[PDB]
Amino acid sequence: RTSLPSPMSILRKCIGMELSKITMPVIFNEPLSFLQRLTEYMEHTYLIHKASSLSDPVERMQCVAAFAVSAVASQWERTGKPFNPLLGETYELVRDDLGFRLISEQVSHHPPISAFHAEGLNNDFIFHGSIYPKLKFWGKSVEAEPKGTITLELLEHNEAYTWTNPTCCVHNIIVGKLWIEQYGNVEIINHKTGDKCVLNFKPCGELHKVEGYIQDKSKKKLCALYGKWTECLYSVDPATFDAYKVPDSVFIIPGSVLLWRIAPRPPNSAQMYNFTSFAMVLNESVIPKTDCRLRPDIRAMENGEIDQASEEKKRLEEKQRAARKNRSKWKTRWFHQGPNPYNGAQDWIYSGSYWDRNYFNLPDIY
Amino acid sequence: RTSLPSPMSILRKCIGMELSKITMPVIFNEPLSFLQRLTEYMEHTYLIHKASSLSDPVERMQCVAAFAVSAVASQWERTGKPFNPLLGETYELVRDDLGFRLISEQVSHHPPISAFHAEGLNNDFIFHGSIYPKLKFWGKSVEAEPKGTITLELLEHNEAYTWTNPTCCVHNIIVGKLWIEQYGNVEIINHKTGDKCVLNFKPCGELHKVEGYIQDKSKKKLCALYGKWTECLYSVDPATFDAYKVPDSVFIIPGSVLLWRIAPRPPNSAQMYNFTSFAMVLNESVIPKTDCRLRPDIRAMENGEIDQASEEKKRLEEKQRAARKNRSKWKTRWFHQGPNPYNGAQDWIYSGSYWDRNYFNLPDIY
Amino acid sequence: RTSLPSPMSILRKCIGMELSKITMPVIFNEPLSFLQRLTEYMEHTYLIHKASSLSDPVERMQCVAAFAVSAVASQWERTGKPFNPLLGETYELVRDDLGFRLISEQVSHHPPISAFHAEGLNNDFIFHGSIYPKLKFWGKSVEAEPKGTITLELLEHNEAYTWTNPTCCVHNIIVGKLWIEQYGNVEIINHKTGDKCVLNFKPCGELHKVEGYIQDKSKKKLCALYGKWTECLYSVDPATFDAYKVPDSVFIIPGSVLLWRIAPRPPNSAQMYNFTSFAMVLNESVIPKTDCRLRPDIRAMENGEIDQASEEKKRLEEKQRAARKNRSKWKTRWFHQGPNPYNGAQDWIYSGSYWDRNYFNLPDIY
Ligand SMILES: CC(C)CCC[C@@H](C)[C@H]1CC[C@H]2[C@@H]3CC=C4C[C@@H](O)CC[C@]4(C)[C@H]3CC[C@]12C
Ligand SMILES: CC(C)CCC[C@@H](C)[C@H]1CC[C@H]2[C@@H]3CC=C4C[C@@H](O)CC[C@]4(C)[C@H]3CC[C@]12C
Ligand SMILES: CC(C)CCC[C@@H](C)[C@H]1CC[C@H]2[C@@H]3CC=C4C[C@@H](O)CC[C@]4(C)[C@H]3CC[C@]12C
């Protein structure tokens, strides 16, 4: 043979031994994929159906403002990490009673970017977005900044809303009391009417308070929002609002309107990873070979067999660690790196044709 | 689904990573279970048959005193640890010529308690007890205190004897000459006649000397016992006894009686873990699935294949480490935590019905 | 049973845990056995066919001098270690056009001694020898001294040549620029005519220069050799030679004769471990079960599957580590520890009968 049928210091060989050394334990993990944890945004989809039927934009704004708060609400007492989705992992949930269907494909493992797309069962809204959790270690706590723009298209009103979820932080992680706190600044934009809803998730510095307002294009406060993201959210007149001025309730301003309050967790919550009645349904047979319900890493943990799922986590990570190396010589099956049509940021637009059962060449993640 | 089909800090997660980190090498081990090492008490069963036929209680006491010494005698030059019996492990030995049959089930792995029961082939005695070795590290040596009461029921005389084996110590273990020494205080009680036999296993401080006496209920020395537990044991008159007063023989007092002396080890001893002619028989097909002869950990080591048995030790320990966790959501098959009927201490009474071949639901240890 | 069917401190048990702790990574390795790396001596076999046809001994000496230089010439830019041959590993190469056939059996793993034997296709020469690489770590470099005597028997002239390859050194290995250098002193002896060819592989201290001379029995310089082992080798008159007097050409003395120059490496060299056009042929079905082409450790690395070959390296080393222990209760199949018939050193004489396809009881290395 003329040549070969294949091609090609100690410290340099050591920088490769350290870069390859990555693993993951399975105890801080909870029996849910991150695609399933993000699916909890649709827990209060009724606020979207309520928003698409109101003829007043500021009343639509209150519902979208309440929906954004209700989406990040179920993150209380749930100090369990979701399974980091393997490259190509997908998930779908069709709630017949709530009236929505959602797709979510793990579109990137480096960085761990997750893209999703949801649509109304009666063609009333379209909900999609992408989230990349940037984990920051600092002091005795750990932050997690959900990088990405959320998009809610109100179909029958020919409008769309965009905002950014606030930063989630896990306090006292070294040797203390784990309690989750969410803070940051959320701004919702009505791209048709020009209405902006500013929301200020206050920090422990008063613990889970959320204060904000809703204004128009001329920048005039129309409603004053207040409450706690672990309890409720109110909408009171702005004039009467300004006239009022593991750490451990809300003060109802006269003339307030209860936009939304938390649904009580089922009795099975305290001893089952503090799940909500909606979260315990995330996990028949026509599902694709990539749906995380088929992931034996998450599945084996759900049956109580701990050590069985821990090895299959190392197994599935090792296959993803090996198949990624063989591709140096990836195809996003349901999303394409397209710009967000309302704000311009590089989003992940839903390609389509997923609800057609005819598909082939889906990667073999597990 | 309403709920789930299964239920549920870093430093706290580290105390679990350290508590779970337990393993065991297989080189200090010797190809014998601890149930087999303890079976060597019956090596000199003839002293029991000799005891049940004598009409003099103090002559019966001398034999039981000699039997207790002969039981811990074979522990010389045998610096090899026996295989720690897995939970539920059993062993049985029926010597047709010696005239006894013995059962021993590993009744507890935490703490490592071993319970046994032996009976005479001609219905002349009943021998049972429980032993828990408490290992103490100190200085450049290692002790092992056999916690538990030995019980010898002389059937035809309607009497029973009870005593406690002395502490075994392994000197010079770090980087020195391993030599076994046994010291402590043993007291044998004749619960029918009130005779007490005190035995003082002297320590290296003279090396393996054993001095003692036999007295009645009125506390009067009847016989004076002396000798070495690695050699012999004599019974001389108490009056003429008091008139006489790897480290490296006995002085026969005038008027002495040789109660017992050691049997010479076979020539195959020096190059086969210093076993005795009785110990090399401990390891046909109607044996239960728990008999340690069926343990592949001990078995593979007996054939010379070292590395084969070392992995199966890790395998059998890992199965015991996994099956114990699945029971948090044990059944002693042949012993029940009953009090010793002669002294009152919490012993392990032999339940019975073992010699009936009909049995089911025996745990799958290997 | 009378006895057993098998025979037999912490710090002493630790000296065994450290002596057994040996492994090997597979990245510095290159997809070639050391038996194949040494086979590159025959890359310029034409110099041997040219030597056996010349009627002048000093012209034969120049060719053997040029052949010895050309043998260690292909070690440039090849900073990849060959696979350490397992005990009993063999290799054979029959180049029909070059006119030679060579056998090489890994005759010893401790120390790693490799023995080979080559013969001319037209019965013109016999080439054999043994090499043991003594690895020395020093400073920021690593040496490798090829211990062993090379033997070239010129058949039709009834003479034989013997010499020793120079020391190979790998500079700047810690965290620097890996570049190979060969230095030492090589002396070729014509045992029939008494001619001696001294070769001085100069060191970096001028980088790869090689200066030497050829003298007779009366110790008189007949030819003066100069050049670089990575370029060429010349033979000029000794009188006109003395009249001339990652670090980074030759000066052609008037009246010089080009004995040999390097063959240009194929274009596939730079991105395929810097192999030569001859080296890329070392790796149909009548080959014995020991030929390193059948070694899956070297084979799997040749197909590009890296991690597949890395485990099979640990596998094949573990089998060699286990089969060597079972022999304490080895047979060299093609060489016998016989003294070299020309200089007297303990060589490895080729037994014979290898080219007969009838053979049995070859060890199962993989
Ligand atoms: C302590 C370690 C080992 C495990 C716990 C880390 C967990 C609590 C971290 C890792 C990633 C984080 C999540 C990243 C993304 C979101 C989406 C956001 O809209 C709500 C918060 C939420 C859900 C974060 C909650 C906290 C989180 C789940
Ligand atoms: C050095 C380590 C790793 C291995 C050696 C430990 C061995 C020698 C220890 C561990 C448990 C100990 C045994 C525990 C129980 C008994 C029963 C008693 O009636 C005689 C002594 C005897 C038999 C002990 C002898 C010494 C012993 C076997
Ligand atoms: C850096 C480490 C991990 C791997 C690299 C070590 C390599 C370069 C070393 C190990 C053994 C050495 C070889 C030992 C034997 C010979 C035969 C001699 O006639 C030419 C040099 C040669 C071919 C040496 C070249 C350098 C060598 C191949």
Author numbering:
A (entry chain A), B (entry chain A), C (entry chain A): 534 to 541, 551 to 747, 752 to 791, 818 to 820, 823 to 857, 864 to 909, 914 to 950
Passage from the reporting paper:
Members of the OSBP/ORP family vary in length: the short ORPs contain primarily a conserved OSBP-related domain (ORD) that can bind and transfer lipids such as sterols, PIPs or phosphatidylserine (PS), whereas the long ones often possess additional functional domains for ligand binding and/or membrane targeting. The OSBPL1A gene (homo sapiens) encodes two proteins: the long isoform ORP1L (residues 1–950) containing the ANK (ankyrin repeat) domain, the PH (Pleckstrin homology) domain, the FFAT (diphenylalanine in an acidic tract) motif and the ORD, and a short isoform ORP1S (residues 514–950) containing only the ORD. Here, our results suggest that ORP1 is a unique sensor of lysosomal PI-bisphosphates, and that PI(4,5)P2/PI(3,4)P2 allosterically regulates cholesterol transport by ORP1.
The most striking feature is that their N-terminal loops (residues 514–546) and lid regions (547–565) adopt different open conformations, distinct from the closed conformations observed in yeast Osh structures. To accomplish the lipid transport function, the ORP/Osh proteins were expected to adopt the open state when extracting lipids from or unloading them onto the membrane, and the closed state when transporting lipids between two membranes. Therefore, the open conformations of ORP1-ORD may represent certain important states when ORP1 exerts physiological functions (see below). In the 3.4 Å structure, the sterol molecule is similarly accommodated in the hydrophobic tunnel. In these ORP1-ORD oligomers, the N-terminal loop of one molecule is nestled in a shallow groove on the core of a symmetry-related molecule, forming multiple hydrophobic and polar interactions. Thus, the lids in three oligomerization states of the cholesterol-bound ORP1-ORD, though adopting different conformations, can seal the lipid-binding tunnel.
